[PDB]
C-alpha cells in the first residue's frame, strides 16, 4: 500500500525474504532492504559457509574475470538470492530488480523512515526453536567482506541517535495520552465511543 | 547492473529514450514535416497523392529537389490540364 516499503532485514530468512521481495518487485512495488548484515539463514554456520565456498569454487577456467562473480557483502548475498528468483535476463526482470535497493546498516534517508518486517520470512515465526541458524554478517566476514566493524560502529551510532529520538517521542506521546484521557469523558468523546472510536 | 545494483539502469535508459524520442517527434511536428490532420484543408485523404502533381502546382504557385518533376512529366501535366480546362469550358 506504501509507495516504498523499507524492510528491516534483521531476523529474516534469506530465501523466504528473497522470494517475498521478488514477488513484490515483479508486482510493481518498490522495496528497500536495510540491515542486510543481520539477515538469517537456516542451518549451522559451518554448513552455510561450506555452501558459500561451493559457490566460490565456480569460475570461468580460462579467464576468471568473466566467471561467476562472488559478491561478498550481505546485501549482495541477499541480492544474489533474489536475482535467482527473477528472470533477470529480460527487460521485465531487469525493470523489477531496479525497484529494489539493498543496504548494510541503515544509511540515510531510511534511518528516518519506518521499517517493516515480513512475518512469513521472519526466522522467529518460521524456523523451529532449537534449530541452528546463520547470521549473514558473520558469513560475509568469514568469506571476505571487510566492513563488518564499520557497519557495527555506524549502527551503534545510529542506535544512540534513534534512542534519543524515541525518548523524545515517548515523552510527547505521554503528553498526548494525558490530553486525550483528560478529554476522554466529554460529550464528544462519548459520542465517538458510540461509534467505535 | 552488477557494479551499481542500486541505480536503475534499464529504467533510466528507457526514461531517457522516451524523453529524447518524443522531443525529436515534437521537433519534427513543429517543423511540419509530419502530414496534417485528416480534417485539415491541407490534407489529401481521399484524394490521389502525386509527387509530380504537387511539384507542378508548387512551381505554378510561385526547395526540395529529391522530389523532382521531369520536363517530360511537366509537359504531360500541362497537356492534361489543357484537356481538363477544355472539358470545364464545354461544361460552362
Amino acid at each position: 500500500v506504501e509507495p516504498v516499503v523499507v524492510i528491516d532485514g534483521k531476523g529474516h530468512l534469506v530465501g523466504r525474504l528473497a522470494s517475498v521481495v521478488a514477488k513484490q518487485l515483479l508486482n510493481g512495488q518498490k522495496i528497500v532492504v536495510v540491515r542486510a548484515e543481520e539477515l538469517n539463514i537456516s542451518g549451522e554456520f559451518f554448513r552455510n559457509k561450506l555452501k558459500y565456498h561451493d559457490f566460490l569454487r565456480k569460475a570461468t577456467a580460462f579467464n576468471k574475470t568473466r566467471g561467476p562473480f562472488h559478491f561478498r557483502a550481505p546485501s549482495r548475498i541477499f541480492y544474489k538470492a533474489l536475482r535467482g528468483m527473477v528472470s533477470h535476463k529480460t527487460a521485465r526482470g531487469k525493470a523489477a530488480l531496479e525497484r529494489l535497493k539493498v543496504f548494510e546498516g541503515i544509511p540515510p534517508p531510511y534511518d528516518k523512515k519506518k521499517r517493516v518486517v515480513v512475518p512469513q520470512a521472519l526466522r522467529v515465526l518460521r524456523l523451529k526453536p532449537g534449530r541452528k541458524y546463520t547470521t549473514l554478517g558473520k558469513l560475509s566476514t568469514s568469506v571476505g567482506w571487510k566492513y563488518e566493524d564499520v557497519v557495527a560502529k555506524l549502527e551503534a551510532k545510529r542506535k544512540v541517535s534513534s534512542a534519543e529520538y524515541y525518548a523524545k517521542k515517548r515523552a510527547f506521546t505521554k503528553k498526548v495520552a494525558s490530553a486525550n484521557a483528560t478529554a476522554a469523558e466529554s460529550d464528544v468523546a462519548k459520542q465517538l465511543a458510540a461509534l467505535g472510536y | 547492473s552488477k557494479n551499481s545494483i542500486n541505480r536503475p539502469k534499464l529504467t533510466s535508459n528507457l526514461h531517457h529514450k522516451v524523453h529524447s524520442l518524443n522531443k525529436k517527434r515534437a521537433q519534427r511536428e513543429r517543423a511540419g514535416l509530419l502530414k496534417p490532420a485528416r480534417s485539415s484543408v491541407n490534407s489529401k485523404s481521399g484524394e490521389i497523392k502525386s509527387v509530380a502533381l504537387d511539384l507542378y502546382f508548387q512551381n505554378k504557385k510561385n526547395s526540395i529537389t529529391t522530389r523532382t518533376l521531369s520536363k517530360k512529366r511537366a509537359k504531360k501535366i500541362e497537356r492534361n490540364l489543357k484537356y481538363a480546362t477544355q472539358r470545364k469550358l464545354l461544361v460552362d
Binding site: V4, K30, K101, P107, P108, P109 | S4, N6, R7, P8, T11, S12, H15, H16
Partner: peptide, 27 residues
Amino acid sequence: WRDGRHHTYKKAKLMKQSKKKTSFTRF
C-alpha cells in the same frame, strides 16, 4: 553546507540524479 558553490553543485547533482532516475540512495 560548505559554501554556495558546493550548495548549488550538490543541489544540481541530486536533482539531475532524481530527474534521470539514477540515484543509488533514493528512487
